[PDB]
Structures are given as C-alpha cells and as structure tokens.
C-alpha cells in the first residue's frame, strides 16, 4: 500500500523492553492455546 513512519514515544525508550520481556519467553518455548 503506502509506507509510513511508526511512532512510539508514549513514555521514553526503556518502557518497551519491560513489555518486550514478556515477548522473549514465548519465543524460545512457543506454545499454542
């Protein structure tokens, strides 16, 4: 379609690695519900 610029400054920079820590434990194990 059309390219765009993603924005993610709703806090800072270190606030996305706290929720992306719940992201990393599901990748090495990977379970389907």
């Amino acid at each position: 379609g059309s390219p765009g610029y993603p924005n993610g400054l709703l806090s800072g920079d270190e606030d996305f690695s706290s929720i992306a820590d719940m992201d990393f434990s599901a990748l090495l194990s990977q379970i389907s519900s």
């Binding site: 920079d13 690695s17 820590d21 990393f24 990748l27 090495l28």
Partner: protein, 115 residues
C-alpha cells in the same frame, strides 16, 4: 568466530564488537560511526537470549548478574524476588546473533567456572 557484526541499541543503529585479550572481556556496541558506545562486561553477565529464526523479531538479549539470595517479601509475607537486568540488541541476520552469542557464551562459561 567473527566477534563483530551489526547491531542496533536504543533505536540508534550501529556495529557490535567483542573485547577479548583485554581486562574481563566486554561486548562493546558502537554507533555506525562510533560516536555512541555501550559496553557489556561478560564477567558480570550470567545469561544470553536471542530471537529464533522462526521468531518475527530480530534481537539479542544479555542477562546480568543479580543476587537472588536477598529474597524480599511484601506486607502480607508474599515472596517478591528482585530480577536480573537484560540488555537487548536488534539485528538483521540470525547468522550474526548466533555467532556473537556463541563467542559470548564461551566467555561467560570461563567466568562460570572461575579459575
């Protein structure tokens, strides 16, 4: 073994380098020119987690050393344990992260035996 490749840290893209033959080996991220620099001493690192080739993500985590024997409890007496800090690096290829982690993994296993 390559020790150096290409990594992103804090949304600023740069190049990653491993520091051996030095005082305890350190994983040094620098900016694409190298005006910005971050350093990970592996004698202070316990674990490392990287994004699989099946994962939508391109990243590499570095887990720091924490003292978990200082187990804390809340007002009711519930176990609240302080967690280690992890250092992430974004990548473009899985063949690099697995080669950086490979070296790293071989560095921490030296500080894991402590001789």
């Amino acid at each position: 073994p390559s020790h150096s490749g290409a990594a992103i840290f804090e949304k600023v893209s740069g190049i990653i380098a491993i520091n051996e033959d030095v005082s305890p080996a350190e994983l040094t991220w620098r900016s694409t020119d190298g005006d910005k620099v971050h350093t990970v001493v592996l004698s202070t690192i316990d674990k490392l987690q990287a994004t699989p080739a099946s994962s939508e993500k391109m990243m590499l985590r570095l887990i720091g050393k924490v003292d978990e024997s200082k187990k804390r409890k809340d007002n009711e007496g519930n176990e609240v344990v302080p967690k280690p800090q992890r250092h992430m690096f974004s990548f473009n290829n899985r063949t690099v992260m697995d080669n950086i982690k490979m070296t790293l993994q071989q560095i921490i296993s030296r500080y894991k035996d402590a001789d």
